[PDB]
Amino acid sequence: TIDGQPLSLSLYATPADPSMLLSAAITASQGGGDLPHAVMPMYRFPVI
């Protein structure tokens, strides 16, 4: 203008949106229990 102020208005850039935070549960896989060696005892079946 006569005073130095601009006629055409300014551009308003869009701000960035807040992102959505993500989490996860990674999982493991260990081996199972393997059977030991069997020993024969001295007692009968109802006692053992």
Binding site: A25, I26, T27, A28
Partner: protein
């Protein structure tokens, strides 16, 4: 190592260097506990590395 920390333990008669080494071992263990539970690691990422 983890062995020879057990042998410095379970004695109750150790040198000052022995208890200093066991204290350094336990403090490195505590640092590792903090470095795991602070960053968040459910060990499937950790034990791979």
């Amino acid at each position: 190592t983890f062995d020879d920390f057990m042998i410095i333990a379970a004695n109750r008669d150790r040198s000052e260097n022995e208890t200093s080494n066991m204290v350094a071992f336990c403090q490195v263990l505590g640092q590792l506990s903090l470095i795991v539970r602070n960053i968040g690691l459910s060990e499937n990422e950790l034990t791979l590395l």
